[PDB]
Design a protein around this nucleic acid. Structure first.
Length: 84
DNA sequence: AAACTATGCATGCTCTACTGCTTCTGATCTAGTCGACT
């Protein structure tokens, strides 16, 4: 016998790997809140591809996912604690 | 010598193909709107 299970596949470059990983691990509400905080408080645009500064037209990529929280002035969280 | 017949020719008409130019039509590429998803 067999069963039908939904599977989602995403391909991203190594440079953008942490950004996509963060975008997909966190909950929908958590991602929305993080994006709103980034754009309103820190004034930076956050999406699944990278972090952008409208003032200085240069990407703020980083080699580790924790750098995203580090540069946004937020304490680091693990995926288990990002449940909305 | 005159009447009838014969050939001969020309021109307008009809059709079928042939070629080239012009216009219409069918196939192929994108903006917007709604919807689906992560």
């Amino acid at each position: 016998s067999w069963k039908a299970v939904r599977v989602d596949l995403v391909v991203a470059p190594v440079s953008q790997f942490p950004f996509a990983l963060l975008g997909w691990t966190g909950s929908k509400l958590f991602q929305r809140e993080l994006r709103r905080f980034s754009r309103k408080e820190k004034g930076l645009w956050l999406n699944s591809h990278g972090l952008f500064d409208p003032e200085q037209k240069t990407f703020f990529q980083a080699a580790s996912e924790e750098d995203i929280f580090r540069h946004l002035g937020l304490e680091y969280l693990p995926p288990e604690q990002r449940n909305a």
